[PDB]
Amino acid sequence: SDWISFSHMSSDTDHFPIKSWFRCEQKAASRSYATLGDMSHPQGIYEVRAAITRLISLTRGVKCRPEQMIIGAGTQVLMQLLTELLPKEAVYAMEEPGYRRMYQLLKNAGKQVKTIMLDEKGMSIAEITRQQPDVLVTTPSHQFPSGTIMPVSRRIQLLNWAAEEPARYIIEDDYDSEFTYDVESIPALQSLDRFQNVIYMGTFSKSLLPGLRISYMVLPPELLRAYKQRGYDLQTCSSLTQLTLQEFIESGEYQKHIKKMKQHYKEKRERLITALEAEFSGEVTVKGANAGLHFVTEFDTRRTEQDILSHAAGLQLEIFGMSRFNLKTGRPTLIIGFARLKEEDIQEGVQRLFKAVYGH
């Protein structure tokens, strides 16, 4: 099987410093072996939380203390916990299109979920004003899946909405925030907030490996107060993985890895986009390519979205359609992930994509 992946759900393994990660694991183990016989602190190991706290403060401008952070064996399990801290009758609002898994979670939890359309600045403040939700779920760095980078002006507008009335919350899902392309980084919503109505959520799945299972979220003082009154929660993220992450960060291996990958991802994205317009002779529209590890491609073709997806499968091309992210009409659109995609598979994979779309 000679498969080529344009999947957004896969990550890079070719350039991941797996030997350094293991060497960090050995060092952390031989240093904190005796602690492995006990269960971790429910919020996660303090030193690990402190290591992440410093990191996100530098890279995203996030203001927090380690006592506010909770780890974190996946965004969903943390989101599950978060819904139980927020008001039970809270009305949730998600981006349309958006993360369907998180949508289905909220629906299955008996919560009312409203869908918010997007403009060129991302999540529409006009629609939020109209539908009047309680909790916002947004992806500022790189809108999942449209890829729109929410500008500061829109970020300020959401912050104002949350601040002008009591019991309003913003869940900043800062997924896929490590990378931008020929545009500058923008501070997180949580950092621009003059108050404390933002829950910041992050993950290491795209910067490290998705199989590692480490996420985190930062609670506002009152929500943190509600969490501590539980007293029955147990840490879900592995202790070995926590201590390995701490060493990986503090040894400087993480920053060294990120520095290497921004250049790698920049070059690969450039080649892929160049190859796309070359093969399609400019008959492909690329959207949301200024950040993240995926972008969107629309096609002027007589074929439907599943006809394309079907042919791609027969051509051994792993790809997903944009209708996957509909929560609640025009040219067919696909999502193109280039994290796992090997550089040598670019020209071949783009040729296979052409056949899946046009036929020949």
Ligand X SMILES: Cc1ncc(COP(=O)(O)O)c(CN[C@H](CF)CCC(=O)O)c1O
Which residues are at the interface with ligand X (CB under 6 A)? 9, 74-76, 99, 101, 139, 144, 173, 175, 203, 205, 210, 215, 234, 324
Q: How far apart are CA 196 and CA 17, in angstroms?
A: 37
Kindly state the smallest distance separating residue 347's Cβ from ligand X, in Å: 25
Q: How far apart are CA 201 and CA 99, in angstroms?
A: 14
Counting residues that bind a second copy (by CB under 8 A) gives: 47
Only one of the segments 52-60, 77-85, 118-126, 300-308 lies at the binding site for a second copy (rule: CB under 8 A); that segment is: 77-85
Asked if 290 contacts 329 with a C-beta cutoff of 8 angstroms, the reply is no
Kindly state the smallest distance separating residue 113's Cβ from a second copy, in Å: 13
Q: Any contact of residue 313 with a second copy (CB under 8 A)?
A: no
Residue with tokens 């429910």: 42
Q: Which of ligand X, a second copy, none lies near 203, with the C-beta cut-off 5 to 8 A by kind?
A: ligand X
* 330 upstream amide cis, omega within 30 of 0: no
Q: Which of ligand X, a second copy, none lies near 236, with the C-beta cut-off 5 to 8 A by kind?
A: a second copy
Only one of the segments 114-122, 188-196, 230-238, 297-305 lies at the binding site for a second copy (rule: CB under 8 A); that segment is: 230-238
Q: Any contact of residue 210 with a second copy (CB under 8 A)?
A: yes
- 3-class secondary-structure state, position 316: coil
Q: How far apart are CA 74 and CA 213, in angstroms?
A: 6
Q: Which of a second copy, ligand X, none lies near 117, with the C-beta cut-off 5 to 8 A by kind?
A: none
Residue 86 or residue 354: which is nearer to ligand X going by CB?
86
Considering only CA atoms, give the Rg of the chain: 21
Kindly state the smallest distance separating residue 108's Cβ from a second copy, in Å: 7
Q: Any contact of residue 37 with a second copy (CB under 8 A)?
A: yes
Q: Any contact of residue 117 with a second copy (CB under 8 A)?
A: no
Residue 11 or residue 146: which is nearer to a second copy going by CB?
11
Q: How far apart are CA 358 and CA 142, in angstroms?
A: 29
The token pair at 25 is 């694991």
One-letter amino acid of 127: E
**Residues 128-167 vs a second copy: string with x where CB under 8 A?**
----------------------------------------
- Which residue pairs from 315-318 have beta carbons closer than 8 angstroms and sit at least 24 positions apart in sequence? 315/352, 315/355, 315/356, 316/1, 316/2, 316/3, 316/4, 316/352, 317/3, 317/4, 317/6, 317/349, 317/352, 317/353, 317/356, 318/3, 318/4, 318/5, 318/6, 318/7, 318/10
Strand partners, 296: 287, 335
Kindly state the smallest distance separating residue 278's Cβ from ligand X, in Å: 28
Q: Any contact of residue 34 with a second copy (CB under 8 A)?
A: yes
Kindly state the smallest distance separating residue 274's Cβ from ligand X, in Å: 25
Q: How many residues does the chain have?
A: 360
Binding stretches for a second copy (CB under 8 A): 9-13, 16, 18, 22, 26, 29, 33-40, 73-74, 76-77, 80, 84, 100-101, 104-105, 108, 209-213, 230-241, 340
